[PDB]
Amino acid sequence: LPMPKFGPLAGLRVVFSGIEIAGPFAGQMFAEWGAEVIWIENVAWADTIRVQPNYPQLSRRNLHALSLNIFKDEGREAFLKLMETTDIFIEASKGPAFARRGITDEVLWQHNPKLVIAHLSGFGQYGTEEYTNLPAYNTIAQAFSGYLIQNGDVDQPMPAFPYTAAYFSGLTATTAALAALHKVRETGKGESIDIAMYEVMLRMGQYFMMDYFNGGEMCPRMSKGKDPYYAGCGLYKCADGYIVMELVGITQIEECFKDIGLAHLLGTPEIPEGTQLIHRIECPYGPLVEEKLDAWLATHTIAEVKERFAELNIACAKVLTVPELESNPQYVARESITQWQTMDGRTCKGPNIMPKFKNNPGQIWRGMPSHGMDTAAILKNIGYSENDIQELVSKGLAKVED
Amino acid sequence: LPMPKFGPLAGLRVVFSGIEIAGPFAGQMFAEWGAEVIWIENVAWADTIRVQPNYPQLSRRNLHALSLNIFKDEGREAFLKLMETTDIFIEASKGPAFARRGITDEVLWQHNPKLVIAHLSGFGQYGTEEYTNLPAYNTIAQAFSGYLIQNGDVDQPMPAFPYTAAYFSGLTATTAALAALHKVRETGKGESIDIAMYEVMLRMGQYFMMDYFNGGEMCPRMSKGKDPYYAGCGLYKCADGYIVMELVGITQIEECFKDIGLAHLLGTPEIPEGTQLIHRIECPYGPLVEEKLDAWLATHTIAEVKERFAELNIACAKVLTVPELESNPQYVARESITQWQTMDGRTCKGPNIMPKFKNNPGQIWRGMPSHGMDTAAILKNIGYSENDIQELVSKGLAKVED
Ligand SMILES: CC(C)(COP(=O)(O)OP(=O)(O)OC[C@H]1O[C@@H](n2cnc3c(N)ncnc32)[C@H](O)[C@@H]1OP(=O)(O)O)[C@@H](O)C(=O)NCCC(=O)NCCS
Ligand SMILES: CC(C)(COP(=O)(O)OP(=O)(O)OC[C@H]1O[C@@H](n2cnc3c(N)ncnc32)[C@H](O)[C@@H]1OP(=O)(O)O)[C@@H](O)C(=O)NCCC(=O)NCCS
């Protein structure tokens, strides 16, 4: 398949079957980094992502587009022969959907014993009848893992946004696939990976949930974007706008208390010598600290707080709106936002490849492919004849380039 | 170093230097999956994570604890010899801090030309003077990437929580390190990776930001946990509590419109045949759909909505509180939450290894190590004498087991 040789993953062959974010995000990350990546869409309908006006130009760039019925007759026989040349297969289904349709892990390893198989689902490959085969999206994974209940304001839980759990789940799939890939390169035998979205998100929400599991209470939600436990952390107003700050570290606490008028608190039974952190609930002075911090910050400009906090080594930043990013000097310097050409021949703007590999940078070599774009190319490369692939399209088992 | 042989990453050697979540999360994930992982803390102070009462039992499990001044005299000479046996080194600093302290990539590859180096920072290894050396935490990365501005309610932006950006950044580091690791196993030459937290989070927030970069407007924030654009997606109230649902798909929309009393809308110029999604803003009927959905849902119990939505293949779930997880039958069936023994000999409860590798499951073999726990073991393994490592402790350059 014609493509430039670049990135740490050059010449690795990846195929994924899934829609929206989670599955496709996992597979396309390989493409960002130079792998050969086949996106499989059904033959009758297309990936739901295509309904989004701009995003798919980013999230499906560098891909090859197959369109094949991977479960019906010869359409299946093709998919499985394809699997013989595949290093990694990502699939995102309602539970063990592939297995209950005939394509088990053992059937797959029959065609490629080295194959790394990554199963992405809401609730896992096995469990109970009630949950295992349920459909799932990001919000479902947030709801079921206790992530959603931790987000929002004191009085109003809400999902983390945009579609946060889909990105964590796809990223975990990518990670786990590369880990399994390493094992294949070291023992010569394939692997199957069972990634349940809610288990991913259960992990991502443990910071305070670990307290509940081990004697404690659950923390509340934030109030107005302030950390539920630690004073001086989260969202604050200066005289001229929103900033964030983290009041963490001995030196930071000592010098900041001095600025805001709380010097006399340092060295008390409650704030002894090496205090690195200020717990707002446990501390009688917790609310006083917030009151004085708020008052001191409201006296200063964002720029002045930034200068003083750079002196004290207190992390902070202006809360940037989307219109402010393009022309930020850090963004500009690092080409964090770039441009590329779509397939239709139009100019498209959005994030560059991340992260930056030094010796083998990733690169944007192709825009989002059309539905079925590369089907004929892929089947001829797998060994199907011109007429033989013409029959596949005919019996409805494949969609050719429009 | 004594440890069981398990997981896809058995016999891979990983060292990380960093505190809190991002850096350590990246390194410890290797440990979940069977790698040998050395956590480096400073000799004078310890990782700030240790101030948290329970979480570190999860986030530092399966680790070996070094405590060494990696920048001063012989402390440096040790670190660099250690680097000769290391496959992957994760470091989290204020920008290019290691390089401006003498330990450049070229110095590191001098001691190991194959080494994969992963640099985690707020703002990158290079850029402008204003930003490149700034300290960063999760909230700083959320603020600077336009992630924070997208979270919260219409009237109140807030961070995604808990510390969402630290997990994305550490997960990306893990992923990118394994990708680079693959390249080393295929060309024999090392790699350096520049992971800027804000660039990670810029990527994770593109779903609607891509509209802004390409002609459009930015979406608003959610109202009460409802999707800013798509009707029938996000947080809803039933008669007896919060659920989430995603109204996506032709069949789902058709049958759900029929239930809620909006049948006559199907087939209009605005909702034609294969409509997969309902845009609340663009659609004159968008608000009507919400009103009827809300009213229909408030008539039913969570259990009844679940049953009907399982018939229509509409993804949904009860919003679970933290006290509801342990005894959920899916959690129980998959052992999603487990127990292990700490070093002090106490019983600790929390998430199991995720995800589940089939042939080479990860496993919890050790609790969180104490500050300096394994220093003497590591230095003797690297080739330092008993007296030779006694001198390191003496000149303040290392901390031994308490
Ligand atoms: C997202 C999800 C709900 C969509 O599934 P769905 O609406 O029920 O069904 P699809 O649109 O994928 O297609 C329906 C059927 O066609 C099949 N189909 C999909 N790809 C096919 C292929 N290329 N060839 C033949 N048939 C195919 C599917 O196997 C599915 O089978 P099933 O009815 O036996 O269960 C489901 O894939 C899922 O829960 N995935 C896991 C979590 C996830 O990735 N969520 C979305 C990202 S946020
Ligand atoms: C988190 C962060 C702000 C903390 O840094 P800090 O408070 O300024 O400093 P540290 O507590 O790490 O230590 C201070 C100095 O001691 C050094 N130190 C750290 N580990 C050391 C080691 N084991 N041996 C000798 N010195 C060490 C550091 O290099 C740092 O050097 P510098 O003063 O030249 O810049 C910073 O590491 C950072 O921005 N990291 C990147 C983003 C990140 O990971 N954030 C935290 C997770 S959410």
Instruction: Enumerate the domain spans of chain A.
Output: 1-223+327-402, 224-326
DSSP A144-209: HTTSGGGSEETTEE---TTTHHHHHHHHHHHHHHHHHHHHHHHHS--EEEEEEHHHHHHHHTHHHH
Kindly determine whether residue A193 and residue B218, on different chains, have CB atoms separated by under 8 Å. no
Q: Cβ contacts (< 8 Å) between A324 and chain B: which residues?
A: 146
Task: Give bridge partners of residue A380 from the DSSP assignment.
Answer: none
Q: What residue type is B374 in one-letter code?
A: D
Tell me B370's DSSP state.
Answer: P
DSSP run (H or E) holding B252: helix B250-260
> Which atom of ligand 2 is closest in space to residue A249's alpha carbon?
7
The reported resolution of this PDB entry, expressed in Å, is 2.4
**Partner B, chain A 250-279, Cβ-Cβ below 8 Å:** 276-277
> How far, CA to CA in Å, does A153 sit from each of A312, B145, B147?
30, 21, 17
Cα B23 from chain centre: 10
Whose CA is closest to atom 29 on ligand 2? B97
Task: Assign domain A224-326 to its CATH architecture.
Answer: 2-Layer Sandwich (3.30)
Question: Is B126 part of the contact surface with chain A (CB cutoff 8 Å)?
Answer: yes
Nearest CA in chain A to B208: A55
What's the CA gap between A257 and A264, in Å, rounded?
A: 9
Of B66, B124, B74, whose CA–CA distance to B99 is shortest? B124
Q: CB of A260 closer than 6 A to ligand 1?
A: no
CB contact under 8 A, B225 and A158: yes
Q: H or E segment at B67?
A: strand B64-67
Top mutation candidate among A25, A42, A133, A137 for ligand 1, by most atoms within 8 Å of CB: A42
Nearest CA owner, ligand 1 atom 25: A69
Of B25, B38, B40, B42, best ligand 2 pocket probe by most atoms within 8 Å of the beta carbon: B42
- Residue A48: how many other CB atoms lie within 10 Å: 14
Chain A hits for B318, CB-CB cut-off 8 Å, are 143-144
For A127: left if phi > 0, alpha if psi spans -120 to 50, otherwise beta; the answer is left
Residue of B nearest to A148 (CA): B319
Ligand 2: atom nearest CA of A248 is 7
Q: For residues A86 and A9, give the distance between their C-alpha atoms in angstroms, rounded to a whole number.
A: 14
Q: Give the separation between CA B173 and CA B138, rounded to whole angstroms.
A: 15
Measured from the alpha carbon of residue B15, the closest ligand is 2
Nearest-10 crossing angle of helices A302-312, A250-260: 140
CB atoms within 10 A of CB B250: 13
Ligand nearest to the CA of A162: 1
Cβ neighbour number for residue B141 with a 10 Å cutoff: 32
Name the residue type at position A80: L
**Torsion (CA) B178, B182, B184, B188 in degrees, nearest 10:** 170
Token pair 């994969």: residue: B116
Tokens of B192: 């350096």
B168 with A163: Cβ contact below 8 A: no
For B313, the closest of A10, A135, A313 (CB atoms) is A135
Q: Give the B window 216-245 contacts with A, CB below 8 Å.
A: 216, 218, 221-222, 224-225, 233-235, 242-245
C-alpha to C-alpha distance for B222 and B155, rounded to whole angstroms = 9
Cβ-based neighbours of A45, under 8 Å, separated by 6 or more: none
Q: CA-CA distances (angstroms) from residue B305 to A181, A314, B259?
A: 42, 49, 11
- Mark out the alpha helices in B16-95 (DSSP H runs): 22-32, 55-59, 73-83
Q: Inspect the interface and report whether the beta carbons of A157 and B126 lie closer than 8 Å.
A: no
Say which experimental method was used: X-ray
Shortest-distance Cα residue to atom 45 of ligand 1: A137
Partners of B183 on chain A (C-beta within 8 Å) are 8-10, 360
How far away, in angstroms, is A374 Cα from ligand 1 center?
21
Within 325-344 of B, beta carbons closer than 8 Å to A belong to 325-326, 329-330, 333-334, 336-337
Domain B1-223+327-402 identical in fold to domain B224-326: no
Say how far apart CA B392 and CA B380 lie, in whole Å.
12
Residue nearest to atom 19 of ligand 2 (CA): B42
For helices B386-394 and B73-83, angle between their N-to-C axes, nearest 10 degrees: 130
- Mutation probe of ligand 1 site: the residue of A15, A16, A17, A19 with most atoms within 8 A of C-beta: A19
Inspect the interface and report whether the beta carbons of A319 and B200 lie closer than 8 Å: no
E-assigned strand segments in B93-200: 116-121, 152-153, 156-157, 191-196
Count, residues in chain B: 402
Provide, as residue numbers in chain B, all residues whose Cβ is less than 8 Å from the Cβ of A9: 179, 182-183
- Decide: A15 in ligand 1 pocket, CB within 6 A: no
Question: Is the C-alpha dihedral spanning B35, B29, A171, B144 positive or negative?
Answer: negative
Looking at residue B265, the DSSP 8-state letter turns out to be: G
* Closest residue by Cα to residue A104 from A127, A83, A135: A83
Work out the burial of residue A231: count CB atoms within 10 Å of its CB; fewer than 13 is exposed, 13-18 middle, 19 or more buried: buried
Nearest alpha-carbon partner for B207 in A20, A356, A157, A314: A20
C-beta of A138 in contact with ligand 1 (< 6 A): yes
B175 to A180: CB separation less than 8 angstroms, yes or no? no
How many beta-carbon pairs under 8 angstroms link A with B? 463
DSSP conformation class of B369 = P
Pair type for strands A152-153 and A156-157: antiparallel
For chain B, positions 31-90, list CB contacts with chain A under 8 A. Answer: 33, 48, 51-55, 57-59
CA distances from A268 to A284, B231, B262, B389 (A): 12, 54, 66, 38
Do B222 and B234 touch, CB atoms closer than 8 A? yes
**Cis bond upstream, residue A162 (ω within 30):** yes
- Please state, in angstroms and as integers, the Cα–Cα distance from residue A161 to each residue in B151, B207, B226, following that order: 6, 10, 10
Question: In this complex, do A164 and B164 lie within 8 Å of one another by their Cβ atoms?
Answer: yes
A1-223+327-402 — its CATH code? Answer: 3.40.50.10540
Q: Is A20 touching ligand 1 by the criterion CB < 6 Å? A: yes
